[PDB]
Amino acid sequence: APQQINDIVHRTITPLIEQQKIPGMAVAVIYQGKPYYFTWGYADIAKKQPVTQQTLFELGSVSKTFTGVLGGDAIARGEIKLSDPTTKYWPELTAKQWNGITLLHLATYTAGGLPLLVPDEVKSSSDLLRFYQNWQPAWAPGTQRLEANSSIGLFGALAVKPSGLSFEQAMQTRVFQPLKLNHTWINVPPAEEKNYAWGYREGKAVHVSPGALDAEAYGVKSTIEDMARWVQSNLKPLDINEKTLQQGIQLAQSRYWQTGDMYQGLGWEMLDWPVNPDSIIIALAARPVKAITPPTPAVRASWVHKTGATGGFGSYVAFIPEKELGIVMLANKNYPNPARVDAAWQILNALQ
Numbered sequence: 001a002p003q004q005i006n007d008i009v010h011r012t013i014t015p016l017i018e019q020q021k022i023p024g025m026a027v028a029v030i031y032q033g034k035p036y037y038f039t040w041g042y043a044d045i046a047k048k049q050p051v052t053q054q055t056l057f058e059l060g061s062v063s064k065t066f067t068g069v070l071g072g073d074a075i076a077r078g079e080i081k082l083s084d085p086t087t088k089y090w091p092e093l094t095a096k097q098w099n100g101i102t103l104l105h106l107a108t109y110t111a112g113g114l115p116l117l118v119p120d121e122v123k124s125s126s127d128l129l130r131f132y133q134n135w136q137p138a139w140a141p142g143t144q145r146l147e148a149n150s151s152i153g154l155f156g157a158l159a160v161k162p163s164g165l166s167f168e169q170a171m172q173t174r175v176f177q178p179l180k181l182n183h184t185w186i187n188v189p190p191a192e193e194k195n196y197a198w199g200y201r202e203g204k205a206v207h208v209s210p211g212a213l214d215a216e217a218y219g220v221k222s223t224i225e226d227m228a229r230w231v232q233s234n235l236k237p238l239d240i241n242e243k244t245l246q247q248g249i250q251l252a253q254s255r256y257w258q259t260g261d262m263y264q265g266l267g268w269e270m271l272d273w274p275v276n277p278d279s280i281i282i283a284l285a286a287r288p289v290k291a292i293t294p295p296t297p298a299v300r301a302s303w304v305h306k307t308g309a310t311g312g313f314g315s316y317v318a319f320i321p322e323k324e325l326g327i328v329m330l331a332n333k334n335y336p337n338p339a340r341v342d343a344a345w346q347i348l349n350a351l352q
């Protein structure tokens with residue numbers, strides 16, 4: 001890779017790994033549309049298996065970007081509408097607080113305080129209906145943003161209802177396959193286990209535990225090769241051949257709500273570029289949102305990003321459409337979000 005990209009990447013990631021005690025890490029920088037990879041340490045400390053470009057890391061909430069886009073694809077197909085009420089696709093949702101809660105609300109965490117996690121005790125399809133039917137909104141729809149897996153996960157599940165496919169088959173055939181993400185999975189196949197890194201939490205190797213709506217909110221595992229093309233796919237969607245998917249990517253980067261200097265998209269979050277670190281550098285943060293009416297089309301001078309975690313993994317994706325610049329950081333250690341965002345910034349700002 002060009003020496004500048006190489007020195008910045010190393011001058012930056014090295015102390016990051018040393019400071020955060022990161023077992024293994026993969027990084028991709030997309031410069032003027034071409035991927036450049038870097039990898040350090042172990043996927044499995046015990047078996048001395050190193051991190052390589054084909055290692056699968058858990059993405060955590062970064063999975064939400066895939067769901068936003070799958071959702072955006074279903075819209076472009078005319079199968080769902082963001083202005084539709086949630087009950088249109090889950091008629092059994094008769095509790096009266098749902099009147100007024102739309103798919104847009106679910107997708108953007110503005111439904112009224114849906115919880116950050118679907119409680120662990122929710123295991124069956126009846127357990128889930130119960131949980132949603134009994135949930136008590138803290139606020140009116142469209143008034144505050146509370147980042148939640150249970151909000152965006154339901155959106156993902158309902159978004160694919162008209163299609164007729166499982167959320168997984170809709171994701172595989174409508175996002176993964178067209179984009180040639182051949183090593184990205186919701187459930188890792190036995191054939192691919194040899195590449196599944198272990199995550200680390202307190203020195204113990206862990207893998208994400210199953211739970212309700214996990215596929216739709218934090219379930220996807222992937223390699224930095226596939227993540228790099230994912231960044232590439234979102235940077236220049238005009239390049240994409242399948243139509244509804246191209247409109248889909250475009251819709252996930254639309255600006256629906258504004259909170260501070262941040263704009264909420266479908267999965268992806270955006271800020272105006274150029275931007276300052278602290279504008280982008282706490283287990284719950286309820287914040288008021290002003291609706292963007294109508295939603296602003298995807299803005300090229302944005303710092304489009306997404307953070308994500310699991311008990312054992314820390315992920316981060318960030319890209320600037322108008323500069324053809326992007327970065328992906330995959331660690332098998334859930335370290336602090338500010339530290340990730342500073343490394344990204346430190347690297348991308350040094351590239352223009």
Ligand SMILES: *C(=O)[C@@H](NC(=O)[C@H](N)c1ccccc1)[C@H]1CCC(Cl)C(C(=O)O)=N1
Pocket residue numbers: 060061062116117118149211217218283307308309310311334
């Ligand atoms: C997305 O990354 C969120 N975390 C998760 O999805 C975890 N995998 C999870 C899922 C179900 C139960 C427990 C944990 C968000 C929101 C929750 C937290 Cl604490 C978090 C973080 O910054 O470590 N990220």
